[PDB]
Amino acid sequence: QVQLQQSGPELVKPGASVKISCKASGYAFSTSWMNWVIQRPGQGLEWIGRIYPGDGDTNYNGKFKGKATLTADKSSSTAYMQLSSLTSVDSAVYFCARRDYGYFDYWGQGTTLTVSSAKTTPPSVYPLAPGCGDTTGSSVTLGCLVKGYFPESVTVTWNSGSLSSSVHTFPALLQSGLYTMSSSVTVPSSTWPSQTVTCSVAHPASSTTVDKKL
Amino acid sequence: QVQLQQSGPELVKPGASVKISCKASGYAFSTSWMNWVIQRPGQGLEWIGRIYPGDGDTNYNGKFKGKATLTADKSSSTAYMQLSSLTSVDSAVYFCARRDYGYFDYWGQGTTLTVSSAKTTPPSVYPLAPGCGDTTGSSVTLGCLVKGYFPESVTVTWNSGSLSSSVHTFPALLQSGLYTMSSSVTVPSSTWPSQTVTCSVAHPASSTTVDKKL
Amino acid sequence: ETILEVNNLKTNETTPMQRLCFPVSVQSKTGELCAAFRADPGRDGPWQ
Amino acid sequence: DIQMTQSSSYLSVSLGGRVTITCKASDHINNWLAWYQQKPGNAPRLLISGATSLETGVPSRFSGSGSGKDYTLSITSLQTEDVATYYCQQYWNSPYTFGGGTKLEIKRADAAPTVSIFPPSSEQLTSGGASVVCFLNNFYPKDINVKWKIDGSERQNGVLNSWTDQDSKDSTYSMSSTLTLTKDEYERHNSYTCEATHKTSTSPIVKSFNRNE
Amino acid sequence: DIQMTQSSSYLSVSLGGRVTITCKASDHINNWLAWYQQKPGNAPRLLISGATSLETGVPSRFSGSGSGKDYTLSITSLQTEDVATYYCQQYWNSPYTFGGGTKLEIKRADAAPTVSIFPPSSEQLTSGGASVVCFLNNFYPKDINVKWKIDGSERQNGVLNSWTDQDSKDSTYSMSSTLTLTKDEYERHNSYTCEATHKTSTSPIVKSFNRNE
Amino acid sequence: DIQMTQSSSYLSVSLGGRVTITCKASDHINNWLAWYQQKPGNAPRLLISGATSLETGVPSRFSGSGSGKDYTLSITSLQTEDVATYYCQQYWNSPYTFGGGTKLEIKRADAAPTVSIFPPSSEQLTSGGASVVCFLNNFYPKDINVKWKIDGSERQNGVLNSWTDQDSKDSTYSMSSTLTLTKDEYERHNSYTCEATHKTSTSPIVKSFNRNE
């Protein structure tokens, strides 16, 4: 079998350089070309460049000609991609594939590059529940808003995972350099507020988990 | 500087010929090509033909091959365009431009050719104002209709130009060989008919200016 | 015979490989000057 | 004969935004194209030469780009003096085919029209013909349908519509319509009315008139 | 630089039916094309190679066909594991131009949305900023228009819409919107409301809110 | 294999007007094209040969023109015998690719449909199957949507729609729909109804039926 193993995610401020590893296994490393593909979230996809490990030559694109530099090592059967002058628009998902008949036969697991100047900040949950002056209707949706957490993302537990069916996990969007998310779950007014609903974020990086009651 | 000076407008009945002058200034007249462009009101635009004043050769189009004839004079630094068999569809705006790198670097001021069999007729204004039987509403629009004036166009003064903001000048459309126009201005029913509104056309060609009170 | 570099520009200093040749294409006018250079082999310029 | 299509004819963007206009031809023009700007009543003005390079005196907000048979024109940002009709030319082969053209206007909210029907003048019948008019004002967008119906009928031809473009102050349009014919048909019936259908509202406004009032 | 257009971006067919996706290029690629299948969060997977031949491990339900510059991909029938984003590649000339992509979803009837506006928290004003929210749930199809109007106005930019794609269970979507700004503008007015316009119904649902309640 | 696209399939113009039909191919055919006219139940008839020259016996109202890959057919004016399906052929290369075809019809105002549901016959249940029918008549234009709903459901497949084209007298269309299945499902419920949605009116006409009446 043929397996392509990449590295993990990277986080670095703009202006520095980053190197990404791709290691082939179960196949001759210097016999076939090794390509690279960028996917810009979420609709963009385009080809970057290829390298032949036997000679070491590189074939780049028009835009990525000066930004990326490809190297290879025949001893460890590993290909490298070095990026220079990293900006905010250079953060995307990178692929590692090989060329056989001219297509891409086998892909990689995928990697995430996030380039930003923000640092790790503890999130602060803001409660939102009905309501003052408005009893309409007998069935209302509940949730809580989360703001100012880096990086993405965090999971929101509800009553230690009591009911996951009607709750919806919304993706995060960057605002003012920080990620913001929301959650919505519907509860009838007959059982509310008889049982107190709880939303709790879990952030592994900042080691900050806040609990909130309503 | 380079300046291209054309002639004024022309009015002639169908079946005759017309010659249009274009005079270059501040540049070598025989060195560069001299083009011609027709713009049919208002959406049509297409290229006519070019001439090289040194040799005198002419390069025409497929449709304008037999209709137009281009000549040039090196002594006066002036180019000529002669049209034969003028019809109603041959009335349009003509341009005079020069060719340098293959584009048109400098244009002319533009000229208007109107080919019709109609003659000069004095206009007659027809009053229109609310109203008999209809008092609705408290704010109504006022104006007057103008018909049978040649050529276009005439200006309509309102109380010697008292209020030009809410009045709208509508373009003329040819009907039965003559041009027709209209004007609309809104006045509240509280101040009407306290002050008498007046519309007056001014036609320089026929020397006919009529005044009308309401 | 050795390669004489006719095209030398301050913009080509980053890519020295473009110095070895000069482009030619379709022209819309008559008698454009494609290139010009000094004929002295011992002068600073293309002959170096 | 190289056909070069410019689509679409009308597109509207507000100020401070970006606009993209595509001019496409049938064959390869070798990146030879010239963008033009013509204000109403004036002559065209050159902007882009060769789909890339600029001119002298033109601001840097105009940037052309493209490859193959698809070429675009990017203008950022948009101001009040940049609103005009844009053209594209192919000088690669003779004859030189000019573009269809794109007229720019500013985008705003929707406004309800105003329909007011007018009686013919009492002394208007001395000329030998009669014309009934109803004028419209303060509407948007361009496309509507004028309707003339007497006892469930529709009358064409002989109707005409004189459009008036937008101005700088209120950015509002206007329209007028009429028809001309002999005397005897005018008194054939009594009630007169007109209306204009619009897309966002299936039920338009109706303004009628009657002769014997 | 060979531009290869893949249209359209979104098309929906139910299960048990047939789907056709067209990938068209500018010039002749000599029947060299590769169809891809990429599930969210995963890597692309090869399906068709050379517009005709299949791979090893791929089911026989996938059949590619085409001639000239027009190439199609026929999938019959459709199952729950075949729903993903499909791509097309041109390996004939360098650089290799990837397709635009087509995201597949399942088609069903229309459902009315639910608009619920929420008050800001009492302790939310301690951070130095205020954000008003109204969340929508249980609607269809994708395209709608969010509307924010206070005393007949429209506020952009600063609004945002976070979409959520369909799942396997209820095949239902959701959306949220908000904006962030300083304190003093919040109490400038009183009543708050939002709505969403839809095509099949000209009159949407309105859910308002008031501060002094 | 040269694909030649003819669009669109249906277009309508009234009598006394002008009609333009475009037939476009993929490559250069060197101005070799043949326009055809086929009346229903009859054989095609040649009109234009080589995109320009006429035939012997064909009236001079038919004038073909075009250049490059875009070719048109201009017919002025239109009469009652010129209404048929028009075709275009490419004889430049083998195999000869025939056009998609354009069916012509006359344009008029809009008419409201008529929905009438019918009970099954009392002796119809002796055959071993039951079919419920509701027939529509006097409507326009072509495109509508037939709707079958019992307790908030939709039933496909097994429905069918038999269209009837326009005639010379009233220029009016008709449609019918039905389905066939076993006995036991028929009495599962009681009320029966059908309707047809239309574009200009969001609320259609409803004609229901009940078994125990």
PDB file of N, CA, C and O in Angstrom, chain A residues 37 39 43 45-47 50 95 99 101-104 107-108 126-128 132-134 141 145 168 170-171 173 175 182-184, chain E residues 36 38 43-44 46 87 89 91 96 98 118 121 123-124 127 133 135 137 160-164 174 176 180 207-209 213:
ATOM      1  N   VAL A  37      -1.116  21.018  -3.499  1.00  0.00           N
ATOM      2  CA  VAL A  37      -2.398  21.624  -3.836  1.00  0.00           C
ATOM      3  C   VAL A  37      -2.871  22.459  -2.654  1.00  0.00           C
ATOM      4  O   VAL A  37      -2.813  22.005  -1.505  1.00  0.00           O
ATOM      5  N   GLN A  39      -6.153  24.611  -1.031  1.00  0.00           N
ATOM      6  CA  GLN A  39      -7.604  24.782  -1.046  1.00  0.00           C
ATOM      7  C   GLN A  39      -7.939  25.984  -0.168  1.00  0.00           C
ATOM      8  O   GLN A  39      -7.767  25.935   1.053  1.00  0.00           O
ATOM      9  N   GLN A  43     -14.422  27.599  -1.165  1.00  0.00           N
ATOM     10  CA  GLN A  43     -14.681  27.352  -2.578  1.00  0.00           C
ATOM     11  C   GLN A  43     -13.444  27.270  -3.463  1.00  0.00           C
ATOM     12  O   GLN A  43     -13.549  26.731  -4.571  1.00  0.00           O
ATOM     13  N   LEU A  45      -9.844  26.139  -5.055  1.00  0.00           N
ATOM     14  CA  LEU A  45      -8.923  25.012  -5.177  1.00  0.00           C
ATOM     15  C   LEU A  45      -8.010  25.297  -6.365  1.00  0.00           C
ATOM     16  O   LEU A  45      -8.498  25.697  -7.427  1.00  0.00           O
ATOM     17  N   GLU A  46      -6.704  25.091  -6.199  1.00  0.00           N
ATOM     18  CA  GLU A  46      -5.776  25.239  -7.316  1.00  0.00           C
ATOM     19  C   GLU A  46      -4.485  24.486  -7.021  1.00  0.00           C
ATOM     20  O   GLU A  46      -4.179  24.150  -5.874  1.00  0.00           O
ATOM     21  N   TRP A  47      -3.727  24.231  -8.085  1.00  0.00           N
ATOM     22  CA  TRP A  47      -2.473  23.491  -8.037  1.00  0.00           C
ATOM     23  C   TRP A  47      -1.302  24.431  -7.772  1.00  0.00           C
ATOM     24  O   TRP A  47      -1.270  25.565  -8.257  1.00  0.00           O
ATOM     25  N   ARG A  50       5.183  20.988  -8.402  1.00  0.00           N
ATOM     26  CA  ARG A  50       5.626  19.604  -8.340  1.00  0.00           C
ATOM     27  C   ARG A  50       7.143  19.548  -8.225  1.00  0.00           C
ATOM     28  O   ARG A  50       7.847  20.520  -8.507  1.00  0.00           O
ATOM     29  N   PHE A  95      -2.453  20.295   0.351  1.00  0.00           N
ATOM     30  CA  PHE A  95      -2.507  18.883   0.007  1.00  0.00           C
ATOM     31  C   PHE A  95      -1.166  18.413  -0.544  1.00  0.00           C
ATOM     32  O   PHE A  95      -0.390  19.189  -1.106  1.00  0.00           O
ATOM     33  N   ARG A  99       1.850  12.107  -8.832  1.00  0.00           N
ATOM     34  CA  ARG A  99       1.424  12.045 -10.225  1.00  0.00           C
ATOM     35  C   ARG A  99       1.882  10.721 -10.821  1.00  0.00           C
ATOM     36  O   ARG A  99       3.050  10.345 -10.679  1.00  0.00           O
ATOM     37  N   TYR A 101      -0.238   8.773 -14.051  1.00  0.00           N
ATOM     38  CA  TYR A 101      -0.615   8.849 -15.459  1.00  0.00           C
ATOM     39  C   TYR A 101      -0.890  10.294 -15.853  1.00  0.00           C
ATOM     40  O   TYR A 101      -1.361  10.578 -16.959  1.00  0.00           O
ATOM     41  N   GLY A 102      -0.601  11.223 -14.947  1.00  0.00           N
ATOM     42  CA  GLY A 102      -0.892  12.626 -15.162  1.00  0.00           C
ATOM     43  C   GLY A 102      -1.988  13.149 -14.259  1.00  0.00           C
ATOM     44  O   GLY A 102      -2.159  14.365 -14.121  1.00  0.00           O
ATOM     45  N   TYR A 103      -2.729  12.245 -13.625  1.00  0.00           N
ATOM     46  CA  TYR A 103      -3.675  12.628 -12.592  1.00  0.00           C
ATOM     47  C   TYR A 103      -3.016  12.495 -11.221  1.00  0.00           C
ATOM     48  O   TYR A 103      -1.819  12.224 -11.100  1.00  0.00           O
ATOM     49  N   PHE A 104      -3.805  12.689 -10.167  1.00  0.00           N
ATOM     50  CA  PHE A 104      -3.332  12.537  -8.796  1.00  0.00           C
ATOM     51  C   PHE A 104      -3.961  11.272  -8.225  1.00  0.00           C
ATOM     52  O   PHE A 104      -5.163  11.239  -7.942  1.00  0.00           O
ATOM     53  N   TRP A 107      -3.779  11.001  -2.341  1.00  0.00           N
ATOM     54  CA  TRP A 107      -3.706  12.280  -1.653  1.00  0.00           C
ATOM     55  C   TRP A 107      -3.154  12.094  -0.245  1.00  0.00           C
ATOM     56  O   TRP A 107      -2.821  10.986   0.181  1.00  0.00           O
ATOM     57  N   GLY A 108      -3.063  13.205   0.478  1.00  0.00           N
ATOM     58  CA  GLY A 108      -2.631  13.204   1.859  1.00  0.00           C
ATOM     59  C   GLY A 108      -3.789  13.388   2.815  1.00  0.00           C
ATOM     60  O   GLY A 108      -4.954  13.473   2.418  1.00  0.00           O
ATOM     61  N   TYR A 126     -21.891  35.097  26.917  1.00  0.00           N
ATOM     62  CA  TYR A 126     -22.916  36.084  27.222  1.00  0.00           C
ATOM     63  C   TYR A 126     -24.286  35.426  27.161  1.00  0.00           C
ATOM     64  O   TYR A 126     -24.692  34.956  26.086  1.00  0.00           O
ATOM     65  N   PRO A 127     -25.022  35.365  28.265  1.00  0.00           N
ATOM     66  CA  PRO A 127     -26.298  34.644  28.279  1.00  0.00           C
ATOM     67  C   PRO A 127     -27.374  35.368  27.479  1.00  0.00           C
ATOM     68  O   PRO A 127     -27.505  36.591  27.511  1.00  0.00           O
ATOM     69  N   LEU A 128     -28.153  34.573  26.750  1.00  0.00           N
ATOM     70  CA  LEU A 128     -29.324  35.087  26.045  1.00  0.00           C
ATOM     71  C   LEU A 128     -30.477  34.117  26.261  1.00  0.00           C
ATOM     72  O   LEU A 128     -30.366  32.937  25.915  1.00  0.00           O
ATOM     73  N   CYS A 132     -38.020  39.317  28.644  1.00  0.00           N
ATOM     74  CA  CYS A 132     -38.648  40.383  29.425  1.00  0.00           C
ATOM     75  C   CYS A 132     -39.683  41.110  28.564  1.00  0.00           C
ATOM     76  O   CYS A 132     -39.368  41.832  27.615  1.00  0.00           O
ATOM     77  N   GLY A 133     -40.946  40.900  28.924  1.00  0.00           N
ATOM     78  CA  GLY A 133     -42.047  41.547  28.241  1.00  0.00           C
ATOM     79  C   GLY A 133     -42.657  40.716  27.131  1.00  0.00           C
ATOM     80  O   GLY A 133     -43.798  40.953  26.729  1.00  0.00           O
ATOM     81  N   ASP A 134     -41.908  39.743  26.622  1.00  0.00           N
ATOM     82  CA  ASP A 134     -42.363  38.889  25.533  1.00  0.00           C
ATOM     83  C   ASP A 134     -42.509  37.455  26.025  1.00  0.00           C
ATOM     84  O   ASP A 134     -41.507  36.779  26.288  1.00  0.00           O
ATOM     85  N   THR A 141     -36.798  29.243  21.232  1.00  0.00           N
ATOM     86  CA  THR A 141     -35.462  28.682  21.107  1.00  0.00           C
ATOM     87  C   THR A 141     -34.496  29.373  22.067  1.00  0.00           C
ATOM     88  O   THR A 141     -34.583  30.575  22.327  1.00  0.00           O
ATOM     89  N   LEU A 145     -24.377  33.079  23.474  1.00  0.00           N
ATOM     90  CA  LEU A 145     -23.411  33.629  22.532  1.00  0.00           C
ATOM     91  C   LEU A 145     -22.007  33.528  23.111  1.00  0.00           C
ATOM     92  O   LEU A 145     -21.804  33.721  24.314  1.00  0.00           O
ATOM     93  N   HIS A 168     -28.047  22.991  17.419  1.00  0.00           N
ATOM     94  CA  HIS A 168     -27.312  23.181  16.172  1.00  0.00           C
ATOM     95  C   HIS A 168     -25.996  23.880  16.483  1.00  0.00           C
ATOM     96  O   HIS A 168     -25.983  24.916  17.155  1.00  0.00           O
ATOM     97  N   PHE A 170     -23.139  26.074  15.147  1.00  0.00           N
ATOM     98  CA  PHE A 170     -22.882  27.036  14.086  1.00  0.00           C
ATOM     99  C   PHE A 170     -21.387  27.288  13.930  1.00  0.00           C
ATOM    100  O   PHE A 170     -20.665  27.377  14.929  1.00  0.00           O
ATOM    101  N   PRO A 171     -20.902  27.403  12.696  1.00  0.00           N
ATOM    102  CA  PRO A 171     -19.471  27.644  12.489  1.00  0.00           C
ATOM    103  C   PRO A 171     -19.071  29.051  12.903  1.00  0.00           C
ATOM    104  O   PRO A 171     -19.892  29.969  12.964  1.00  0.00           O
ATOM    105  N   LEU A 173     -17.043  32.667  12.675  1.00  0.00           N
ATOM    106  CA  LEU A 173     -16.631  33.673  11.707  1.00  0.00           C
ATOM    107  C   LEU A 173     -15.746  34.699  12.398  1.00  0.00           C
ATOM    108  O   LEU A 173     -16.041  35.134  13.514  1.00  0.00           O
ATOM    109  N   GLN A 175     -14.254  38.075  13.448  1.00  0.00           N
ATOM    110  CA  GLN A 175     -14.678  39.464  13.563  1.00  0.00           C
ATOM    111  C   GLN A 175     -13.719  40.190  14.492  1.00  0.00           C
ATOM    112  O   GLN A 175     -13.488  39.740  15.619  1.00  0.00           O
ATOM    113  N   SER A 182     -22.281  30.967  17.786  1.00  0.00           N
ATOM    114  CA  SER A 182     -23.578  30.997  18.445  1.00  0.00           C
ATOM    115  C   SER A 182     -24.175  29.597  18.440  1.00  0.00           C
ATOM    116  O   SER A 182     -23.751  28.717  17.686  1.00  0.00           O
ATOM    117  N   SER A 183     -25.173  29.398  19.299  1.00  0.00           N
ATOM    118  CA  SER A 183     -25.856  28.117  19.399  1.00  0.00           C
ATOM    119  C   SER A 183     -27.338  28.367  19.637  1.00  0.00           C
ATOM    120  O   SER A 183     -27.726  29.337  20.292  1.00  0.00           O
ATOM    121  N   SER A 184     -28.163  27.475  19.093  1.00  0.00           N
ATOM    122  CA  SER A 184     -29.608  27.609  19.205  1.00  0.00           C
ATOM    123  C   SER A 184     -30.228  26.243  19.452  1.00  0.00           C
ATOM    124  O   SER A 184     -29.916  25.276  18.751  1.00  0.00           O
TER     125      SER A 184
ATOM    126  N   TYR E  36     -13.281  14.112  -9.295  1.00  0.00           N
ATOM    127  CA  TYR E  36     -12.891  13.937  -7.904  1.00  0.00           C
ATOM    128  C   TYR E  36     -14.120  13.984  -7.007  1.00  0.00           C
ATOM    129  O   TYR E  36     -15.165  14.535  -7.364  1.00  0.00           O
ATOM    130  N   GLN E  38     -14.761  14.864  -2.866  1.00  0.00           N
ATOM    131  CA  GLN E  38     -14.194  15.322  -1.601  1.00  0.00           C
ATOM    132  C   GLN E  38     -15.323  15.526  -0.601  1.00  0.00           C
ATOM    133  O   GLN E  38     -16.188  16.386  -0.800  1.00  0.00           O
ATOM    134  N   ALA E  43      -9.959  14.347   2.346  1.00  0.00           N
ATOM    135  CA  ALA E  43      -9.209  14.615   1.132  1.00  0.00           C
ATOM    136  C   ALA E  43     -10.012  14.186  -0.097  1.00  0.00           C
ATOM    137  O   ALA E  43     -10.889  13.322  -0.006  1.00  0.00           O
ATOM    138  N   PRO E  44      -9.738  14.782  -1.256  1.00  0.00           N
ATOM    139  CA  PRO E  44     -10.415  14.349  -2.483  1.00  0.00           C
ATOM    140  C   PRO E  44     -10.104  12.897  -2.816  1.00  0.00           C
ATOM    141  O   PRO E  44      -9.070  12.351  -2.428  1.00  0.00           O
ATOM    142  N   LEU E  46     -10.282  10.093  -6.179  1.00  0.00           N
ATOM    143  CA  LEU E  46     -10.406   9.955  -7.623  1.00  0.00           C
ATOM    144  C   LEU E  46     -11.559   9.023  -7.972  1.00  0.00           C
ATOM    145  O   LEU E  46     -11.787   8.018  -7.293  1.00  0.00           O
ATOM    146  N   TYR E  87     -15.308  17.520  -8.345  1.00  0.00           N
ATOM    147  CA  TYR E  87     -14.351  18.362  -9.045  1.00  0.00           C
ATOM    148  C   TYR E  87     -13.975  17.735 -10.382  1.00  0.00           C
ATOM    149  O   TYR E  87     -14.231  16.555 -10.635  1.00  0.00           O
ATOM    150  N   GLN E  89     -10.539  18.018 -13.329  1.00  0.00           N
ATOM    151  CA  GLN E  89      -9.173  18.477 -13.541  1.00  0.00           C
ATOM    152  C   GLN E  89      -8.798  18.357 -15.010  1.00  0.00           C
ATOM    153  O   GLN E  89      -9.264  17.453 -15.708  1.00  0.00           O
ATOM    154  N   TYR E  91      -5.376  17.805 -16.923  1.00  0.00           N
ATOM    155  CA  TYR E  91      -3.952  17.496 -16.856  1.00  0.00           C
ATOM    156  C   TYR E  91      -3.288  17.544 -18.231  1.00  0.00           C
ATOM    157  O   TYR E  91      -2.112  17.209 -18.370  1.00  0.00           O
ATOM    158  N   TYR E  96      -2.223  22.869 -14.263  1.00  0.00           N
ATOM    159  CA  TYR E  96      -3.434  22.057 -14.253  1.00  0.00           C
ATOM    160  C   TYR E  96      -4.547  22.861 -13.596  1.00  0.00           C
ATOM    161  O   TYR E  96      -4.448  23.249 -12.430  1.00  0.00           O
ATOM    162  N   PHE E  98      -8.024  23.249 -11.940  1.00  0.00           N
ATOM    163  CA  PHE E  98      -9.074  22.536 -11.232  1.00  0.00           C
ATOM    164  C   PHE E  98     -10.427  23.191 -11.489  1.00  0.00           C
ATOM    165  O   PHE E  98     -10.526  24.389 -11.763  1.00  0.00           O
ATOM    166  N   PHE E 118     -33.652  38.340  20.154  1.00  0.00           N
ATOM    167  CA  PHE E 118     -33.215  38.126  21.522  1.00  0.00           C
ATOM    168  C   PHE E 118     -32.705  39.420  22.143  1.00  0.00           C
ATOM    169  O   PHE E 118     -32.041  40.215  21.469  1.00  0.00           O
ATOM    170  N   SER E 121     -27.857  40.745  27.034  1.00  0.00           N
ATOM    171  CA  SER E 121     -27.778  40.427  28.451  1.00  0.00           C
ATOM    172  C   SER E 121     -27.572  41.691  29.279  1.00  0.00           C
ATOM    173  O   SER E 121     -27.008  42.684  28.812  1.00  0.00           O
ATOM    174  N   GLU E 123     -25.629  41.939  31.974  1.00  0.00           N
ATOM    175  CA  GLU E 123     -24.210  42.054  32.279  1.00  0.00           C
ATOM    176  C   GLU E 123     -23.350  42.119  31.024  1.00  0.00           C
ATOM    177  O   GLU E 123     -22.121  42.174  31.126  1.00  0.00           O
ATOM    178  N   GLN E 124     -23.970  42.115  29.842  1.00  0.00           N
ATOM    179  CA  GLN E 124     -23.231  42.195  28.589  1.00  0.00           C
ATOM    180  C   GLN E 124     -22.645  43.580  28.343  1.00  0.00           C
ATOM    181  O   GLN E 124     -21.695  43.709  27.563  1.00  0.00           O
ATOM    182  N   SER E 127     -18.541  44.834  29.076  1.00  0.00           N
ATOM    183  CA  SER E 127     -17.377  44.603  28.228  1.00  0.00           C
ATOM    184  C   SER E 127     -16.968  45.831  27.425  1.00  0.00           C
ATOM    185  O   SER E 127     -15.834  45.890  26.935  1.00  0.00           O
ATOM    186  N   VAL E 133     -28.987  40.448  18.551  1.00  0.00           N
ATOM    187  CA  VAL E 133     -29.055  39.220  17.771  1.00  0.00           C
ATOM    188  C   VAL E 133     -30.513  38.837  17.543  1.00  0.00           C
ATOM    189  O   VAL E 133     -31.381  39.042  18.395  1.00  0.00           O
ATOM    190  N   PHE E 135     -32.075  35.165  15.718  1.00  0.00           N
ATOM    191  CA  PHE E 135     -31.665  33.919  15.081  1.00  0.00           C
ATOM    192  C   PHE E 135     -32.813  33.308  14.288  1.00  0.00           C
ATOM    193  O   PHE E 135     -33.977  33.396  14.687  1.00  0.00           O
ATOM    194  N   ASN E 137     -34.204  29.721  12.128  1.00  0.00           N
ATOM    195  CA  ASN E 137     -34.068  28.273  12.119  1.00  0.00           C
ATOM    196  C   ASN E 137     -35.190  27.672  11.286  1.00  0.00           C
ATOM    197  O   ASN E 137     -36.258  28.272  11.135  1.00  0.00           O
ATOM    198  N   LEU E 160     -23.182  40.008   9.518  1.00  0.00           N
ATOM    199  CA  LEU E 160     -22.585  38.751   9.093  1.00  0.00           C
ATOM    200  C   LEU E 160     -23.625  37.645   9.181  1.00  0.00           C
ATOM    201  O   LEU E 160     -24.540  37.697  10.008  1.00  0.00           O
ATOM    202  N   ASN E 161     -23.476  36.643   8.320  1.00  0.00           N
ATOM    203  CA  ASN E 161     -24.390  35.509   8.257  1.00  0.00           C
ATOM    204  C   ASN E 161     -23.578  34.223   8.287  1.00  0.00           C
ATOM    205  O   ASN E 161     -22.758  33.983   7.394  1.00  0.00           O
ATOM    206  N   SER E 162     -23.805  33.401   9.310  1.00  0.00           N
ATOM    207  CA  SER E 162     -23.126  32.113   9.443  1.00  0.00           C
ATOM    208  C   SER E 162     -24.111  31.026   9.028  1.00  0.00           C
ATOM    209  O   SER E 162     -25.063  30.714   9.744  1.00  0.00           O
ATOM    210  N   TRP E 163     -23.875  30.447   7.856  1.00  0.00           N
ATOM    211  CA  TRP E 163     -24.724  29.392   7.332  1.00  0.00           C
ATOM    212  C   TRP E 163     -24.337  28.039   7.923  1.00  0.00           C
ATOM    213  O   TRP E 163     -23.194  27.805   8.326  1.00  0.00           O
ATOM    214  N   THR E 164     -25.314  27.136   7.971  1.00  0.00           N
ATOM    215  CA  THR E 164     -25.079  25.768   8.422  1.00  0.00           C
ATOM    216  C   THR E 164     -25.675  24.823   7.390  1.00  0.00           C
ATOM    217  O   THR E 164     -26.861  24.935   7.063  1.00  0.00           O
ATOM    218  N   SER E 174     -30.034  26.398   8.953  1.00  0.00           N
ATOM    219  CA  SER E 174     -30.142  27.415   9.991  1.00  0.00           C
ATOM    220  C   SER E 174     -29.240  28.589   9.633  1.00  0.00           C
ATOM    221  O   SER E 174     -28.319  28.465   8.822  1.00  0.00           O
ATOM    222  N   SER E 176     -27.734  32.629  11.428  1.00  0.00           N
ATOM    223  CA  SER E 176     -27.669  33.610  12.501  1.00  0.00           C
ATOM    224  C   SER E 176     -27.018  34.882  11.979  1.00  0.00           C
ATOM    225  O   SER E 176     -26.225  34.838  11.034  1.00  0.00           O
ATOM    226  N   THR E 180     -21.701  44.332  15.865  1.00  0.00           N
ATOM    227  CA  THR E 180     -21.029  44.812  17.066  1.00  0.00           C
ATOM    228  C   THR E 180     -20.625  46.268  16.885  1.00  0.00           C
ATOM    229  O   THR E 180     -20.070  46.637  15.844  1.00  0.00           O
ATOM    230  N   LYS E 207     -40.937  39.535  13.597  1.00  0.00           N
ATOM    231  CA  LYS E 207     -40.782  39.379  15.036  1.00  0.00           C
ATOM    232  C   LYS E 207     -40.027  40.583  15.575  1.00  0.00           C
ATOM    233  O   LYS E 207     -38.846  40.772  15.257  1.00  0.00           O
ATOM    234  N   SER E 208     -40.701  41.392  16.385  1.00  0.00           N
ATOM    235  CA  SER E 208     -40.150  42.643  16.879  1.00  0.00           C
ATOM    236  C   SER E 208     -39.721  42.506  18.334  1.00  0.00           C
ATOM    237  O   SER E 208     -39.893  41.462  18.971  1.00  0.00           O
ATOM    238  N   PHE E 209     -39.159  43.594  18.858  1.00  0.00           N
ATOM    239  CA  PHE E 209     -38.705  43.653  20.238  1.00  0.00           C
ATOM    240  C   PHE E 209     -38.719  45.107  20.685  1.00  0.00           C
ATOM    241  O   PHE E 209     -38.643  46.015  19.854  1.00  0.00           O
ATOM    242  N   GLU E 213     -39.980  47.268  27.635  1.00  0.00           N
ATOM    243  CA  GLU E 213     -40.992  46.286  28.026  1.00  0.00           C
ATOM    244  C   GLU E 213     -40.848  45.854  29.483  1.00  0.00           C
ATOM    245  O   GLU E 213     -39.748  45.832  30.035  1.00  0.00           O
TER     246      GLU E 213
END
